[PDB]
Structure formats: structure tokens, C-alpha cells
Amino acid sequence: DPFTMTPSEDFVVTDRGGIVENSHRVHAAVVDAKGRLLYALGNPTRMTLARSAAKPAQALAILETEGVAGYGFDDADIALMCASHSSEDRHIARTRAMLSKIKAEEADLRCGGHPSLSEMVNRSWIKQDFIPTAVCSNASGKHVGMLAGARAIGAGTDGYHLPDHPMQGRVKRTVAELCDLDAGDVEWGTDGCNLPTPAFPLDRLGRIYAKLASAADGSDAGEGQSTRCAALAHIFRAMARHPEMVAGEGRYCTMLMRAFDGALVGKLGADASYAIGVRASDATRQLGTDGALGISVKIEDGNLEMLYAVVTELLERLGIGSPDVRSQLASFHHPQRVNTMGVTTGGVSFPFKLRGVDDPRLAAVAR
Amino acid sequence: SEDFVVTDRGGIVENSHRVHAAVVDAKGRLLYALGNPTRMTLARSAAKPAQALAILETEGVAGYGFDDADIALMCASHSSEDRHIARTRAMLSKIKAEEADLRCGGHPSLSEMVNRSWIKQDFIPTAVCSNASGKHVGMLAGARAIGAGTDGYHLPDHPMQGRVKRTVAELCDLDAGDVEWGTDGCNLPTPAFPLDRLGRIYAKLASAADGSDAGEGQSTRCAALAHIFRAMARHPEMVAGEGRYCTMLMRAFDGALVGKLGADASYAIGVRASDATRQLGTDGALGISVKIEDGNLEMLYAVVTELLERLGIGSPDVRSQLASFHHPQRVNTMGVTTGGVSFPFKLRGS
Ligand SMILES: [Cl-]
Numbered sequence: 001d002p003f004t005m006t007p008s009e010d011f012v013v014t015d016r017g018g019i020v021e022n023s024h025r026v027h028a029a030v031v032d033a034k035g036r037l038l039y040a041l042g043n044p045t046r047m048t049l050a051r052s053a054a055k056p057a058q059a060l061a062i063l064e065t066e067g068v069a070g071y072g073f074d075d076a077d078i079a080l081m082c083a084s085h086s087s088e089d090r091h092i093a094r095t096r097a098m099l100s101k102i103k104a105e106e107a108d109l110r111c112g113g114h115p116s117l118s119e120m121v122n123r124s125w126i127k128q129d130f131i132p133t134a135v136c137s138n139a140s141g142k143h144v145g146m147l148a149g150a151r152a153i154g155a156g157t158d159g160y161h162l163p164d165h166p167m168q169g170r171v172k173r174t175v176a177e178l179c180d181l182d183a184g185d186v187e188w189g190t191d192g193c194n195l196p197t198p199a200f201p202l203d204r205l206g207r208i209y210a211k212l213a214s215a216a217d218g219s220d221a222g223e224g225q226s227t228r229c230a231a232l233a234h235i236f237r238a239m240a241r242h243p244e245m246v247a248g249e250g251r252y253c254t255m256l257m258r259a260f261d262g263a264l265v266g267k268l269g270a271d272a273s274y275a276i277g278v279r280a281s282d283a284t285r286q287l288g289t290d291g292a293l294g295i296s297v298k299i300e301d302g303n304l305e306m307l308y309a310v311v312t313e314l315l316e317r318l319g320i321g322s323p324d325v326r327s328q329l330a331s332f333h334h335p336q337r338v339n340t341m342g343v344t345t346g347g348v349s350f351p352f353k354l355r356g357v358d359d360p361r362l363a364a365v366a367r
Numbered sequence: 368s369e370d371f372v373v374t375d376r377g378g379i380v381e382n383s384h385r386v387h388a389a390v391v392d393a394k395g396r397l398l399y400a401l402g403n404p405t406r407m408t409l410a411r412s413a414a415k416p417a418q419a420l421a422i423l424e425t426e427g428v429a430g431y432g433f434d435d436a437d438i439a440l441m442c443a444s445h446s447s448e449d450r451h452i453a454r455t456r457a458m459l460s461k462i463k464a465e466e467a468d469l470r471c472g473g474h475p476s477l478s479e480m481v482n483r484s485w486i487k488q489d490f491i492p493t494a495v496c497s498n499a500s501g502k503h504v505g506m507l508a509g510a511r512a513i514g515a516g517t518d519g520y521h522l523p524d525h526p527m528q529g530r531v532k533r534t535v536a537e538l539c540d541l542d543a544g545d546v547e548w549g550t551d552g553c554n555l556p557t558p559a560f561p562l563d564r565l566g567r568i569y570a571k572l573a574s575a576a577d578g579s580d581a582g583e584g585q586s587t588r589c590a591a592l593a594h595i596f597r598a599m600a601r602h603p604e605m606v607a608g609e610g611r612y613c614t615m616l617m618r619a620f621d622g623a624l625v626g627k628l629g630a631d632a633s634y635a636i637g638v639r640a641s642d643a644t645r646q647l648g649t650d651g652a653l654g655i656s657v658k659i660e661d662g663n664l665e666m667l668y669a670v671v672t673e674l675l676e677r678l679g680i681g682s683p684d685v686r687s688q689l690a691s692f693h694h695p696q697r698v699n700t701m702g703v704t705t706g707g708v709s710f711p712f713k714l715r716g717s
Contacts, residue, residue: 014662016409017549018560021631022662057525112700126486137700189377194701208458271381301661302374302382340472340497341554 003359008367010041010352012241012299012306012313014337017343023246025300026310026352027202033214033291035180036208039318039356041192043295045201051188052084053177053269054198054236055142057208057306060172063231064147065167066228067152070099073145078235079242080141084268086118086248087136094245100253102148109134110161111143120250139193141245161195163188178211179204192270202273202296210294212265213347216317217280217292236277239265252308252332259328260321272307274343276315280301283320288356308332310326315348372659372673376705385660386670386712387562390678393574395540396566399678401657405561405699411551412444413629414535414558415502416595420504421534423591425527427512431461432615433505438598439605444628446478446608447496454605455500462508469494470521470554471503478608499553501605506531506555506686521555523548527554532663538571539564552630560712562656569637570654572596572625577639577652593655596637600623610633612668612692619688620681632659632667636675642662666708668692672707673710686694 027042113132126361219233243257387402475493551557575592605615
């Protein structure tokens with residue numbers, strides 16, 4: 001029944017010859033630069049672990065730490081602080097160059113190695129029995145930034161990754177401030193990279209990225225800015241100008257940001273969250289706002305392949321970009337469903353309904 | 368009906384996965400359920416024992432001399448270990464066939480350890496490495512056995528697939544039109560039917576083994592089902608491989624049950640009559656089928672193991688061999704425990 005559809009029915013679905021294979025629940029929030037909710041899928045206020053989608057907020061805490069500007073981190077360095085990188089040799093090299101700028105060493109890192117987020121990098125590692133170490137962590141840039149912050153204020157580097165350290169105190173305050181939430185409304189776990197990681201309603205993730213894009217807009221216009229807005233503009237610029245540092249070759253975040261050529265930034269969170277900050281454009285205006293836009297997505301069951309398909313479909317439905325811009329992501333949008341003999345056996349479809357002509361008696365129960 | 372398995376990071380919900388499950392008696396009557404026990408579901412590799420039945424029921428196939436390990440391979444989603452490839456080639460030799468006659472393709476190994484070995488050695492898997500290579504060799508065997516020709520053995524209009532289609536519905540006790548069909552990863556037709564009927568197949572496998580073991584006047588079909596159960600339980604390493612859930616499950620239970628994975632996170636178990644099954648209020652064998660709605664295998668194995676615990680199937684000791692699947696490790700790159708898995712669902716009885 002098309003006239004009683006509900007958020008509980010917002011799915012991305014795979015089929016095999018028309019027969020349902022898997023289905024995945026979708027949550028999404030589209031917010032303006034003050035966080036007002038414009039469009040939604042599923043439960044746009046789902047309490048959600050941001051994971052690496054929080055990294056631009058953590059980078060802001062680092063950049064607002066007094067004395068860090070003296071280290072001479074450049075834009076590509078800041079993009080690495082914002083990264084879940086593929087552990088390509090260029091990311092490892094930049095991590096070592098950042099350690100040298102702050103006079104630290106790999107032994108000071110409290111993140112650990114892991115299989116590369118790139119299958120092609122990981123294939124090279126397997127061929128040489130290479131065991132990844134702390135410096136190959138996808139989060140290595142954030143960790144060097146955190147060491148830099150710790151050294152800059154005289155706190156000392158041991159323990160920089162623990163909640164009681166002033167660097168983590170700065171992070172926690174900064175996250176809650178960008179979300180416009182009280183401390184008690186942000187929850188904290190421990191991340192795979194061994195730092196505190198926040199959880200907050202999904203729409204507030206979109207709000208953070210709308211603030212990133214809004215600051216970029218104010219910077220490009222030559223508006224006076226607070227030190228925080230200037231730094232947010234710097235983070236947006238770094239990510240958009242060095243998207244290979246934020247992920248790597250063949251990675252969704254890198255291909256998405258290169259396709260849009262400065263119009264937006266986007267960032268993955270583990271277990272299938274995504275956030276995009278969209279600069280003010282004709283597209284955003286047609287969606288009903290005068291400023292920048294934020295988009296946040298969570299696939300309830302954590303499937304990454306579905307996340308990238310859904311994010312790309314959502315950009316298409318919001319009219320963000322052109323068909324030629326978004327066609328660079330066609331392989332993510334409609335993932336291949338081909339068997340071991342080259343036969344196409346199925347595909348992906350998007351039975352969700354953006355909400356933002358319905359009878360007023362149709363309840364939209366966030367689910 | 369709102370039955371989930373949930374992972375958390377420090378008590379904070381990370382992911383949740385919808386679970387469907389059917390526990391049936393030997394005649395398929397529903398005894399316990401999670402979610403939607405009649406969910407229309409692609410059985411994928413969990414259908415392979417029924418495809419093995421079609422092969423073994425083909426006239427002339429017994430003349431090839433397949434043994435219980437070969438039949439176990441027909442029923443398998445093997446890890447493509449060297450020993451699976453070797454048995455595949457041995458089975459081709461028994462029917463005087465060539466790897467070039469197989470119509471399945473190579474794929475990255477279902478064992479990441481095997482796959483890593485392949486990567487290190489620049490190995491490109493071919494048809495004989497397919498996890499379903501035993502099924503395809505059996506299909507070639509049945510095609511040759513009735514003189515139908517190996518050409519096109521995997522196509523729906525070939526009599527071997529006609530036999531498979533008919534056998535799947537007969538075992539489900541469904542009319543042909545109630546089973547839907549697509550194309551599998553291994554390039555054969557693959558069936559979809561309500562989830563509880565997958566449990567029904569496996570209860571019939573275990574029931575047949577109980578009847579064989581009991582000296583009961585069986586048809587040739589029940590005798591073949593009994594043989595299929597015996598081959599899987601005696602050679603579980605062929606059905607999956609070292610470290611695989613199916614192999615470890617069947618080894619732990621030492622003949623009391625067979626279990627089989629289906630791609631995109633289905634699972635089927637046939638349980639022979641036991642103190643545990645009588646405790647569940649049935650005087651015969653039992654079948655269990657499970658589907659994780661979003662396709663996550665890690666959650667599948669954890670749920671199945673929890674389900675065996677809730678049903679009292681096995682002893683705590685026997686199930687503890689599966690502890691690493693039951694509560695998956697949730698540790699970060701520095702050895703800190705960051706989370707865990709919870710099972711807020713409740714079995715509903717009849
Ligand atoms: Cl260094």
C-alpha cells in the first residue's frame with residue numbers, strides 16, 4: 001500500500017533473479033547548517049556510534065590546541081588526521097613525516113596495526129608476510145595529531161589516548177559542542193584504533209558536517225570568522241584538496257570527493273556510517289535551505305557495500321551533483337552481482353522513501 | 368517476532384541483525400520459532416544435501432563407486448583446501464571426466480587462511496577449486512549415468528536439473544510452483560522456499576538416519592537420505608574444512624547431527640532423536656533452519672550456537688567447543704575488549 005509507507009520500511013535490498021536475498025534497514029538525516037531536520041530515512045535520531053566519521057571533529061580539537069600551529073602541519077597532513085586511510089606507502093610516509101615534525105617516534109603511538117582497508121594494499125602485504133605495525137594504522141594521522149596536541153600543552157605523551165588526558169578532555173568537549181549537545185547526551189566507547197569514540201543521535205553527525213561546509217562557505221566569501229569557524233574551513237579545505245589522504249585510491253571517500261571537486265566532503269565510519277557536508281549550491285537551495293547541508297547515514301546491520309550504494313542513491317534523490325559527476329560512483333551505486341561464470345544473477349534496489357502529499361493521518365514513527 | 372542479535376561497543380548499540388528461525392519435527396510441524404519462520408528464503412548451499420539426493424537417486428550412479436567422503440563433498444561448501452581439490456579430481460577420474468567439463472567457476476576461498484596462501488603464491492582459482500565442485504562432479508555423474516551428455520548439465524532444461532527441481536519440491540512437500548528458482552554463485556539453479564521447509568529437509572535427513580540405525584523398512588529414498596546424513600557426519604571436514612563452523616559443529620556432536628551453511632547467512636541442522644529432542648516435546652528427529660535477514664555470517668554462527676544452547680541440544684561441554692563462534696571476539700588493535708554480542712530474542716513455542 002503506497003499510502004501507508006513508514007520509516008520502518010526504509011530498506012536497501014539485494015535480490016537473486018527477483019527473489020529477495022538480504023534486506024538492510026537504512027537510517028538517514030539531511031540537516032541544514034543549524035541542524036534543522038530537512039529530510040529523513042528510518043530513524044534520523046538513532047543513537048549511533050560515529051566511529052571514524054567523528055575524525056574531522058577530533059581534528060578540530062587538535063587544531064584548536066594551543067601551540068600545534070607551530071609544528072607546520074600542512075593541508076595534506078590535516079587530511080591525514082581526518083583519514084581512515086588505506087595504509088598505502090604514501091600514508092605511512094606522511095605519518096612518519098608528521099612524527100618527525102613533532103619530534104616523536106612510532107613507539108609513542110597507542111594505535112595498532114591491522115589488515116589494510118584496501119584489498120590491493122593488503123594483497124601486497126600478504127605476498128611478503130608483512131605484519132602491520134602502529135604506523136600503518138588507518139588512524140595513524142589522528143594519533144600523531146593527538147601526540148602533537150599533548151606535547152604542545154606540556155601534558156606529556158604517555159596516556160594521550162586515555163579519557164583522563166587533557167587531549168581527550170578537549171576531544172569530548174569539542175564533539176559535544178559541535179553536536180550542540182550537553183556532555184551527558186554523548187556516549188563514549190573505545191574505538192578500534194584505541195581512542196575514545198563518541199555516540200550521539202545520527203542527525204547530529206549531519207549537523208557536524210553541515211558546520212564544516214558552512215565554514216568553508218564563509219571562508220570562500222571572505223566573511224569574518226571565529227577561530228573555530230576558520231579551523232573548520234581549514235579542515236574542509238584539507239579534506240577536499242587531499243582526498244587521497246583521507247582514504248586512498250579506489251576508496252569511496254576519495255572517489256566521491258574527487259568527483260565533486262570541492263563541492264562537498266564525505267567520510268566513512270566503521271560499521272556503515274557515512275557523513276557528507278555539502279557547500280551551499282543550487283542543489284541545496286532547491287532542497288529548501290539558504291545555506292550548507294549535512295547528510296548522515298547508518299545501515300543498521302553494518303554492511304559497507306550497502307552503505308556506499310545507499311549514500312550514492314541518496315545523493316541522486318537529493319539532486320546533489322550532476323549525473324556525470326555521480327556516474328564516477330556507478331560501481332558503488334549498483335554493485336555487481338555476477339557469479340563465478342560471469343553470469344549476472346541479481347542486483348540491488350532501494351525501497352526506501354525520503355520524507356521531508358501524505359495524509360496528515362499518516363504517522364511517521366522513527367524506526 | 369521482533370527477534371534480533373545485537374552487537375555493542377561499551378554497552379552502546381553498534382549493529383543489530385534480524386533473525387528468523389524454524390524448529391520443526393520430522394513431519395515439518397513447527398515447534399519453535401524466531402522472527403518469521405516461513406520467510407521465503409534462498410537456501411543456497413543449504414540445499415546441497417537435496418541436490419545430492421537427486422544425484423544418488425539417478426540410475427547408474429552407484430556404478431561409479433563414490434564413497435562416503437565423495438558424497439560428503441557433493442554436500443559441501445568446502446574451503447578449497449588442497450585435500451578438497453584432490454578429492455574433486457579423484458571423483459572426476461571415477462566418472463572419466465575432465466576439469467574442462469565442470470561448469471562452475473573459481474572464487475576466493477571461503478577460508479581466509481587458504482585465500483591468503485593463494486594470494487601469497489599468485490594462485491588463480493579455477494573450476495576444480497569451486498566450493499561446490501563436489502556438487503558439480505555429481506551432476507556430471509548423473510548426466511553421464513543416464514546418457515544425457517555432459518553438455519549443458521547445469522541448465523534448467525537438462526534432465527539432471529529437471530530431476531533436481533522435482534526432488535527439492537518433493538522433500539519440501541511443496542508443489543513445483545511453490546518453489547522459486549534463480550541462478551547460484553556456482554552457476555546451477557538454486558531454490559527458494561519458506562524457511563521452515565529447509566528445516567523440514569534436515570529433519571527428514573536425521574529421521575532417515577534414525578530409521579536406518581533402527582532396522583526400519585525404508586524406501587530407497589529414505590535409505591539414500593540416511594546415507595547422506597552418514598556421509599556428512601563421518602566426513603565433516605569435506606563438508607567445510609579446518610576451522611569451519613560446519614566441521615567443528617559436526618565433530619563436536621560426533622554423529623548426533625549434521626549442519627550445513629548457506630551463503631548469505633542461512634543455516635540448517637538435522638538432529639537425530641535424543642534426550643534433548645524428547646525434552647523439546649517430540650518423539651522423533653528435529654530440523655532447525657536459520658536466516659539472518661541482512662546476510663551476516665558472523666552473527667549467523669553466534670545465533671545458531673545460542674539456539675542450540677536454548678534448545679539444550681548437546682551438553683555444555685560439547686557446545687563449548689563452539690565458544691569462539693558463540694561470542695565472537697570484540698577486541699581492538701591493542702588488545703582492549705571493546706564490545707560484545709547479545710541475544711535479546713526469545714524462542715516462541717507452539
Ligand atoms: Cl619518524
